Symmetry: D2
Subunit: 377 residues, 4 copies
């Protein structure tokens, strides 16, 4: 270890798992005593306590009458460059090849200092290219001009090499949750408040309600489970598929047993009253909602898309089914909700496995290691 580092972090602090990961990583590094600078647009964050060595820099992105589009990329690069000059930063940690790796590359030019840049891929660069190949060259450049590139799963590293066609080494470093924010415990005080009887089994799904999440499979799965087991499906979040999914609960005549609770700041309290977590996505590079529930003690059922099959060990820590397979998913779910022996076995394997592979201290050490490798090249 070469020691204390001055670190600039850029992400979208309010978008999905990537914003949580980048913020919590920054907090962990700050608690060890690194000097951590966040540089994001005018978007809020979740920071429990102020630390003298952790600063949130925020830039306002305004169109004037001069620009055709609000100049996010240039405004953010300028701000990062100003933080580099003012605080003599050692390195940048950018989340996403676009826009943020390019923003860091531009900021290094604007700052005059040859700062090192780590870029972490979360899968959004693959998503973008599924709609539109305009940014293919930018994604490739942001990957190849970063000093080190990481990915939140091995599946994502392989898919990136396929789709972007680069020989750049991509280092898989998994996601983590902060153990103190997700106590392994089970509560029922909140269960009554939301109209769930103590003898009802609770299935939970937490997402942005995009089509890629296949909440249609989740609701189809729940309807089959509901036939055999009195239960509730809790859906946390909001997004594009909200209304189609609400109508699907009426077609399957399960409307009174599906609770659309909206967006929640404190998801751990809802995991604590849950029995099963579902993530049946078509594409998923990691699936932070699974690890959050698993850390709480909730056993997972996932699809075999992307990194979900790295998070869940099929048959040991939970179950993995094919994308779209509501028959198998409801079979596994009914078993787990009937069979305390299976549930307790997977749950105890799961709590041990996530501590060995996804511990916040272990993962921070991995990131910190590659920070110093960058600085010594």
């Amino acid at each position: 270890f070469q020691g204390h580092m001055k670190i600039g972090i850029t992400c979208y602090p309010s978008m999905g798992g990537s914003g949580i990961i980048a913020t919590e990583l920054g907090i962990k590094l700050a608690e060890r005593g690194h000097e951590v600078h966040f540089i994001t647009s005018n978007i809020p964050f979740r920071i429990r306590k102020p630390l003298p060595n952790m600063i949130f820099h925020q830039v306002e992105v305004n169109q004037y009458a001069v620009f055709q589009y609000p100049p996010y990329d240039i405004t953010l690069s300028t701000k990062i460059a100003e933080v580099i000059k003012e605080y003599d930063l050692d390195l940048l940690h950018m989340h996403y090849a676009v826009p943020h790796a390019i923003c860091g590359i531009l900021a290094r030019e604007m700052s005059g200092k040859d700062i090192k840049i780590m870029t972490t891929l979360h899968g959004t660069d693959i998503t973008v290219l599924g709609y539109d190949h305009s940014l293919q060259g930018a994604i490739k450049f942001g990957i190849e001009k970063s000093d080190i590139v990481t990915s939140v799963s091995k599946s994502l590293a392989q898919e990136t090499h396929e789709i972007i066609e680069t020989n750049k080494e991509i280092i898989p470093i998994y996601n983590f949750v902060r153990e103190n924010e997700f106590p392994t415990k089970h509560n029922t005080a909140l269960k009554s408040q939301f109209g769930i009887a103590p003898d009802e089994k609770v299935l939970i799904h937490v997402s942005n309600f995009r089509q890629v999440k296949r909440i249609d499979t989740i609701i189809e799965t729940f309807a089959k489970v509901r036939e055999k087991i009195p239960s509730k499906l809790i859906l946390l979040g909001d997004g594009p598929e909200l209304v189609p999914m609400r109508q699907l609960t009426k077609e399957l005549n399960v409307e009174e047993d599906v609770l659309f609770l909206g967006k929640q700041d404190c998801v751990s309290e809802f995991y604590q009253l849950s029995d099963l977590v579902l993530l049946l996505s078509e594409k998923e590079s990691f699936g932070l909602t699974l690890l959050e529930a698993m850390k709480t003690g909730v056993v997972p059922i996932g699809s075999n898309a992307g990194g979900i099959k790295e998070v869940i060990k099929h048959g040991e820590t939970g179950f993995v089914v094919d994308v779209g397979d509501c028959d198998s998913a409801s079979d596994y779910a009914i078993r787990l909700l009937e069979d305390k022996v299976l549930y307790n076995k997977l749950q105890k394997n799961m709590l041990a496995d996530i501590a060995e592979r996804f511990g916040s201290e272990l993962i921070t050490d991995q990131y910190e290691y590659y920070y110093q490798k960058m600085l010594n090249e």
Copy 2:
């Protein structure tokens, strides 16, 4: 006919066929003596000559430090409402259910006058819903609160009823080209300038280079044609697939015979040197580039997506193939480039057919008819 009308038109004047259609329709109505007001954002237009009775109102969409996003919808509605009050408009003709039908509905509220609203669907509302169902309710509302709804093909009207689930009557009114802008003629003066020998056959495709256009099928088709016939493929336009398509011409070793000419203001001069026009799209509600080429005398080969199979009469005015079928497309193309008798026969049927179904005077009469029907309800 009840006579002279005061008409407000809103479109995106620079986006694809819809902007051309809405602008040329407005010009035709202005030439008959209607008072025509365009109300669009700060985007240029193509207007040949000023008319005292045709005014272009343009609104600037600025973010300040106050809005999170540039308030296009509200700014435009406000501007339309101001034009309604100042000039006592009789009706609005909005292009797209979103945003523009909603903008007209809001502007009618803001103006205080019960103006009538026609909305023309171009298919972009189906495109939007393929990505994201957030706007499903807005699209349905914009359709159902318009006084009359039209669509640029019968295929689009049926697909709308399927996907939006409304009993609203949708009136098919086809697209047109301005006959004087597309003379039926064949030139070769420009052919040499662009490095095309007089004995070379020319295939032309004109689009926005989005994936839905299947320019991969077009280039695969050309490579098969190139085996038997010395020829050039001219690709007009630019967009997301430019670089992947350029690389595909190197894989098929046809790179020197594919001309990527970029965006062109004056496409008729390129149709005039062309022998075949191709539009092999996966989704296409009309296909204005086909009618433009056909009016020039160029025989078309299209896919059977959407309205293309209404524009081309398969076997009579051109050929229609299955989406992706480069084998059949190259068969038809080689025939047409070898066989003057087939070419001349389809060409003469085509010039007669487009005059009977897509004449600018006929189509303007159809729109003008439904304007007056709205005003008399």
Copy 3:
């Protein structure tokens, strides 16, 4: 009182005082048992605990390849309309004439129900019109078609009548802070962490660093205070003037005594170690940072812009100076930092005055009263 209400609230949850006010008002109403629905774009919020009767609906604003600008206004109106239909809302509370009053007016149309709409003005509609009169008609319409319009100060109500020229009644209802989030207490544990000696006086300013905040006057004021009194100026926040203001501290040779701490989630802990709060803005309709500091026990010095001179009672609860008058501001500040008798007197008047005029229970009662007045008209 007519009782329980189903309420939809729309604001920008992450922009300045307006987002805090609208969120905390919603929380207070939810704690009394009203059914409270927030409907905002994909922007985070600060909600301490989940309540079964408080739902956060969040809409994703995406450009496709179809829109020129991300359709915030229409997307949000659609979402509000869906919440109206699904939960049979009684009323909407929109913050800002633009965009949100217009969004609520459009959503009422889209929902089919004649819901009542309250709109609260925060001054941003005056700001917008200082740059650009495009939205003048929209602001006037949003005010005049709301069922009730409020303003966060009397100054703002008068300035609105001047600049928008409407006979609409605007009801002044002041801002508030949540008393439990801002305990009246003084800590020094955090003071050492940030390198402030126990015998140093602390001046604090909290803002978005826009030019209208006149942080140049604040820093000029501090430099004069620093001549007579060992002290630190803490600047919380970030924004456009950060770099010019940092350079101004070098010109005045006070750089080591000005602490640029960045954006902070938990400002109350910094107010708790502060002795004076400064808000010397050119335009300020209320000034939520003053009330937050005052509730903590910190005595204020403000300009006489807008509502600041309604929040501070000059000579009784703090001091008010002319915009730009760093001479007077430093005079008042040196006095307050030398004179415990003056400080304690103003502080005790201030704590009593803010409880009588700005108490969260009192203000919520005022809003709740006008909600029911709307419903009974």
Copy 4:
């Protein structure tokens, strides 16, 4: 001269004088035989004829569900970099320090080739900094990392050195009009169409209707002229001040003599029927509308803001008044509309002066000269 150059040009083709200048410069260079590539966003342009050596590359700027803002800067830089690689460009000519100089600087990095970059300042970088200092560092960097920087007037070069504080040399190169697009002639055929009697004097103003244009001074000036001389004021364009200015014509009771004609594609035909052109702006780095009218034969009255007093030679080719001075402006205007001897004298000096200083061939030669100087450094 070192000869033929491969040139990439980036501007906003639809925004004011800068878009006209950059496009016409590119056309002039293409007519001499340079290989000219335009690279802009999905915004139309005005190109009279296709040239094999002039290509318009256009990039689509889409938000997905992944970006918070449409990534204009990165999308455009990527596209420029692709054109650099594909066509082996020698140099970039970027218009505006932000965003376009930064875009070219980023594209040079992305391309791998050390291309030279000229940046032309038009004054928008000063405008931006009047609202908001966030981009100060970006503007300075874009200026200092360009190989050559030009400005459209000497006033703008001096104001830039004041406000940005750089020792970078800025080369003044004036704007021009294309002589063939603005024939020196006077028509009256169009005058009747727009309801102007043959014996009426015509004053014309052409702008974007922003506040900086002081159309209030122009209308106040016209009202004084109207007292002594039967005349019409033609206002071409549209924008934020349209409605306030229309109301000002009612207060001054000149409403029937002010013609709000909207946006016009073909302004030369309106200059041809005009007697006086007015540009009384508070800030104006050149004023392309003046040169267009002057080339048509119309004598100008301007303010002394920025470059207007370089375009107009006060007393020799027209008159210059203080910003806001409607008394002097109406004095000069009444004289010029009464006095054929003065009018003819200034008109003949003006036509000679604009040919010596602002000829399209001369200005293109100046740009071409500095292109080659860049390439030889």
